[PDB]
Design a protein around this ligand. Structure first.
Ligand SMILES: O=C1O[C@H](CO)[C@H](O)[C@H](O)[C@H]1O
Ligand SMILES: [Mg+2]
Ligand SMILES: [Mg+2]
Ligand code: NA
Ligand code: NA
Ligand code: NA
Ligand code: NA
Ligand code: NA
Lengths: 1011, 210
């Protein structure tokens, strides 16, 4: 019947969805949430055979194992085993758009397993099998007999196997299809894989069982009282002796308990649900749940006979919290939330889309350590364990239905079609039915990028109906349609409007006050972290803090979707779109994370951690005002550490206990600071330290920090008198200056410093020249589809203007001998096709002390696209182990992404001055640098710089970091000015005007000498 | 002490180039043992009779942002016309110059002074690349005001009718000038982007025969 090409058939014989069950037969075990003998796992070694299409599968496979099959591990994505290639496409579907049809050549994975079943399981009760995740559709067989069918890759499919099993050995046969009508609703921007990627288990339930249960918590005005209501549903033999007891626990103390027989209240003319009961438990002064303090209670639901016989027990963690929208604000337990969130896909560089506990824990610890308090399940229900973890560690969650039809034209072609309503409703309803009891979930999402159709409105209402405790949001069709309680745009900018027809992305500040608008605004996606990005991140957070109704957003996104491949030597390297023969593909657009696939942070993570701090500071004289942005907890594990340093030199320091109530303030007056002797700038640096370890951080953890410039005493003392006088030697070809063991050589043909000698060794491999370009960042390339080349992208404008091809034309090069120095004056003009782009005028003054003062003045044609940078570069002949500097650091920082960096004395190994972005680009820059030390060299002034073994040219010509090769010597790029990196999105110019080098005339000066 | 600051010479040297004389100077402005600003300059006079003045200023970060960063002098001559290539023709400042247009403007010297009843800095014109007055010509990228009244007199006179034209012509040429503000006139109202807080500034002017 080809059910995989019929949106009308999304399952066959599948059991109803419900909350996590373990069918404990002992209440104490359910209370402690210990393992259940009634719940077995079938994960492990299975048999697998790949086929080009289902019609290729031999009939024998249903009854007997295939010799050609191999033994592989499950869960797993078969692309991760090499049976076929994983495909990375963003918007464009991986198959021809001809709904509900899929390619005749449909990759088919035949999984099979021989397992044992204890006769005890078949003598009573019900035995079902559960597939937590199968991509994308499958047929099931047990001992040769067809069982059922299922679709939707992100929610569990359950089947009753009671009448198929036999005591002893049994054999399952699962035929998984890569493509199905279900694929049309799974066009998320990620790797397209397939197989049984989530747990497979066997559950045993009594004939008379708990088939479903809902837990709700209502509160009085001040949350000093609560009522926990638990609706429990049963199946099987309904009798007067049956009872349900719901007891609530706080540790080993039972705080509440209620018992009752079945038979709900009357609801209509036909009566009520005789197979249901609702228990109501009163709880005084309940401990409230939040990401700040994840207080949890344990609820045990016991199905039993009135006289004391337990039939079965189920249970869940209960988080007492109220989520409601009032007067335009999203409130948690009555307080306005400030969502510090991030989008997180389920990705692993080695295992694909298979998740494991360790990876989940690592992510959560890293997220909380970096001040995140929320996560969005982009763009499908997650692995069941994820929610449990979020409940226990404390993270607000946006549970999103597995629905995305981005490739359709228009985007809502299927979501506005009533014939697709059935398939869609199952993706929404089954999600809610599964996760409604998790306190961590505070908002339901109808899916992602599927336009806005009537089906969305229908399902929006369905949820409001069945679960009035959680707000419902959906961004499609404009981000503010009738299908969302929250204005949830993606990449809407802070101050700039993007008036797209039909679906404009207004400036978020302006969006809130549009006539008639009252809803709160929380971006479902913003600050695209693709490669060297997150510029302008601070601008969002300043707005979030100033506008009550701007309540945050979810950064896009958590981790690069890169996969590991191996070279001929068996060495691993990160791969992206197209690296597996997959085509069409969207190359590196699958890597947009704050951390690498292996979870190593990207420089942008620190910027996020800083802007998302929970403590705000203000300075007034000797007083530091600390404000808490916590809504519930007190600062009971925080101490303030302060330090005053003069140009990196520690003068004073100390620590003060932090004792601020949520939303409160605390004043801390610093001691009488001693007026410094030396000249220079005094800097005050404060940091919040967590003395004690927690469940998510180690002792000493730094959660916040801030810097301030204090007093400054400008140096008015003239340096000592020079002993010698530099000597000039002229030739038609050069101007050579000598002073002791030091020598400078200027080429009279090029007009550049071509060499220097410190002692008996040369210092340059390449002449010191002007640089007005940079290896393009992903934000400069600005493309989200490897097929669209936006001529408006910065890289395209620089290329068309000739910035990368302009050649320096010498206009002047003269030498002058002064009383105590030699002066070299030069002027160059860079041109492209008779067009003068830049003009650089310099002077090099080498005096008797051995120092070279380089004064640079540049003119940039007002009509040429603003340049990426304005500085100099050269390849030093030597390679040193350390890089020392007085400026912003220690990590990479750019003009629009440097609030996190601190001014101080930093010292790192050369390697740390290079950021390993998978797709190479300008990187490792450090700004606000007053002094740079490398080997025998020292540069002084006020500049930005990056130093490494890779030239801008190599970075520019290389697609993968693993293909880079250290060049001889060290490449140095010292800029007087550098363009912002942007990142509001990576498919259009996103660098704010204030970070564009548009001044027309620039000036900077550097002093080069020996250390 | 900005109104008290005293120029204290730190350096003053002379050098002869192939076709010019280079005067290098350095000054420090202090008050109560505190260096407010450091002005470093070079003067280059070439054979064409042009004096190129390069100025680099340091402003202590802990001192309030200065009202302006420039040079001034009282010219002996009194011409009746003022010609310049820049924003105009009317008085305009950094945060109030959108209405002015870049072009060649020529007005009588009086028009270069705004008669506010309560005297104060006035008549400035921004984004100027060339200014002509009598036999003088100034080129660069600066703001300037020119009139018969010194900033000192304007600052000491409460009513405009009490102002007296001084001998010669006072010239104020600024590489940078602070915004005037106005959101209200009873509290700091000059927006951050219009405050001279960069710490380090640089500008260049060329003085020559008209
Ligand atoms: O709009 C979006 O932008 C992201 C770009 O990386 C990614 O494709 C998300 O899934 C999509 O919702
Ligand atoms: Mg179907
Ligand atoms: Mg998409
Ligand atoms: Na807000
Ligand atoms: Na992407
Ligand atoms: Na504390
Ligand atoms: Na590249
Ligand atoms: Na006055």
């Amino acid at each position: 019947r080809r059910d995989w090409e019929n949106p009308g058939v999304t399952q066959l014989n599948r059991l109803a969805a419900h909350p996590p069950f373990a069918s404990w037969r002992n209440s104490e075990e359910a209370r402690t949430d210990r393992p259940s003998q009634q719940l077995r796992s079938l994960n492990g070694e299975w048999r697998f055979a790949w086929f080009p299409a289902p019609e290729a599968v031999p009939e024998s496979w249903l009854e007997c194992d295939l010799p050609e099959a191999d033994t592989v591990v499950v869960p797993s994505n078969w692309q991760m085993h090499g049976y076929d290639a994983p495909i990375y496409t963003n918007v464009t579907y991986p198959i021809t758009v001809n709904p509900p049809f899929v390619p005749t050549e449909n990759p088919t994975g035949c999984y099979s397993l021989t397992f044992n079943v204890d006769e005890s399981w078949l003598q009573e009760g019900q035995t079902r099998i559960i597939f937590d995740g199968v991509n994308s559709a499958f047929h099931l067989w047990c001992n040769g007999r067809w069982v059922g069918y299922g679709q939707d890759s992100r929610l569990p499919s359950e089947f009753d196997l009671s009448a198929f099993l036999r005591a002893g050995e049994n054999r399952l046969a699962v035929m998984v299809l890569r493509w199905s009508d279900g694929s049309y609703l799974e066009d998320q921007d990620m790797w397209r894989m397939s197989g049984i990627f989530r747990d497979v288990s066997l559950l045993h339930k009594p004939t008379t069982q708990i088939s479903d249960f809902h837990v709700a918590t209502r509160f009085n005005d001040d949350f000093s009282r609560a009522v926990l209501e638990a609706e429990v549903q049963m199946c099987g033999e309904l009798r007067d002796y049956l009872r349900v007891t719901v007891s609530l626990w706080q540790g080993e103390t039972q705080v509440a308990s209620g018992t009752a027989p079945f038979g709900g209240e009357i609801i209509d003319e036909r009566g009520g649900y005789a197979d249901r009961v609702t228990l109501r438990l009163n709880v005084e002064n309940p401990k409230l749940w939040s990401a700040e303090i994840p207080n949890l209670y344990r609820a045990v639901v016991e199905l039993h006979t009135a006289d004391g016989t337990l039939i079965e027990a189920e249970a869940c963690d209960v988080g007492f919290r109220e989520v409601r929208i009032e007067n335009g604000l999203l409130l948690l337990n009555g307080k306005p939330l400030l969502i510090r969130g991030v989008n997180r896909h389920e990705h692993h560089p080695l295992h694909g889309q298979v998740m494991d506990e360790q990876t989940m824990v690592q992510d959560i610890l890293l997220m909380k350590q970096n001040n995140f308090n929320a996560v969005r399940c982009s763009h499908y229900p997650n692995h069941p364990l994820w929610y449990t973890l979020c409940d226990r560690y404390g993270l607000y969650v946006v549970d999103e239905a597995n629905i995305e039809t981005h490739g359709m034209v228009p985007m809502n072609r299927l979501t506005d079609d009533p014939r697709w309503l059935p398939a869609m409703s199952e993706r929404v309803t089954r999600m809610v039915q599964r996760d409604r009891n998790h306190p961590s979930v505070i908002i339901w999402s109808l899916g992602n990028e599927s336009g806005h159709g009537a089906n969305h409105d229908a399902l929006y209402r369905w949820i409001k109906s069945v679960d009035p405790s959680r707000p419902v949001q959906y961004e499609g069709g404009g981000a503010d349609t009738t299908a969302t309680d929250i204005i949830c745009p993606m990449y809407a900018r802070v101050d700039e409007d993007q008036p797209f027809p039909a679906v404009p992305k207004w400036s978020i500040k302006k969006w809130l006050s549009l006539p008639g608008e009252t809803r709160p605004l929380i971006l479902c996606e913003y600050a695209h972290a693709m490669g060297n990005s997150l510029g302008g991140f601070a601008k969002y957070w300043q707005a979030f803090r100033q506008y009550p109704r701007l309540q945050g957003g979810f950064v896009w996104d958590w981790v690069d979707q890169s996969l590991i491949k191996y070279d001929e030597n068996g060495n691993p390297w990160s791969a992206y779109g197209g690296d597996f023969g997959d085509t069409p593909n969207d190359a590196q657009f699958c890597m947009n994370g704050l951390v690498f696939a292996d979870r190593t942070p990207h420089p942008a993570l620190t910027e996020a951690k800083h802007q998302q701090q929970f403590f705000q500071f203000r300075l007034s004289g000797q007083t530091i005002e600390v404000t808490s942005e916590y809504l519930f907890r007190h600062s009971d594990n925080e101490l303030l550490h302060w330090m005053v340093a003069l140009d990196g030199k520690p003068l004073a320091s100390g620590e003060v206990p932090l004792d601020v109530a949520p939303q409160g303030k605390q004043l801390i007056e610093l001691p009488e600071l001693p007026q410094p002797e030396s000249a220079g700038q005094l800097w005050l640096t404060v940091r919040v330290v967590q003395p004690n370890a927690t469940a998510w951080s180690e002792a000493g953890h730094i959660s916040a920090w801030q810097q301030w410039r204090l007093a400054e005493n400008l140096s008015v003392t003239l340096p000592a008198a020079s002993h010698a006088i530099p000597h000039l030697t002229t030739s038609e070809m050069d101007f050579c200056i000598e002073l002791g063991n030091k020598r400078w050589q200027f080429n009279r043909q090029s007009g550049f410093l071509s060499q220097m000698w410190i002692g008996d060794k040369k210092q340059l491999l390449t002449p010191l020249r002007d640089q007005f370009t940079r290896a393009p960042l992903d934000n400069d390339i600005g493309v989200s589809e490897a097929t669209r080349i936006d001529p408006n992208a910065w890289v395209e404008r620089w290329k068309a203007a000739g910035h990368y091809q302009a050649e320096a034309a010498l206009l002047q090069c003269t030498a002058d001998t002064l009383a105590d120095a030699v002066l070299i004056t030069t002027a160059h003009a860079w041109q492209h096709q008779g067009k003068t782009l830049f003009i650089s005028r310099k002077t090099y003054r080498i005096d008797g002390s051995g120092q070279m003062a380089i004064t640079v003045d540049v003119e940039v044609a007002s009509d040429t696209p603003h340049p990426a940078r304005i500085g100099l570069n050269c390849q030093l002949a030597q390679v040193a182990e350390r890089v020392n500097w007085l400026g912003l650091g220690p990590q990479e920082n750019y003009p629009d992404r440097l609030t996190a960096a601190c001014f101080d004395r930093w010292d790192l190994p050369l390697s740390d001055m290079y950021t390993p972005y998978v797709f190479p680009s300008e990187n490792g820059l450090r700004c606000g640098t007053r002094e740079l030390n490398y080997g025998p060299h020292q540069w002084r002034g006020d500049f930005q710089f990056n130093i490494s073994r890779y030239s801008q040219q190599q970075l520019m010509e290389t697609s993968h970091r693993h293909l880079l090769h250290a060049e001889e010597g060290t490449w140095l790029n010292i800029d007087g000015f550098h363009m912002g990196i942007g990142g509001d999105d990576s498919w259009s110019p996103s660098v704010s005007a204030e970070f564009q080098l548009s001044a027309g005339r620039y000036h900077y000066q550097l002093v080069w000498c020996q250390k």
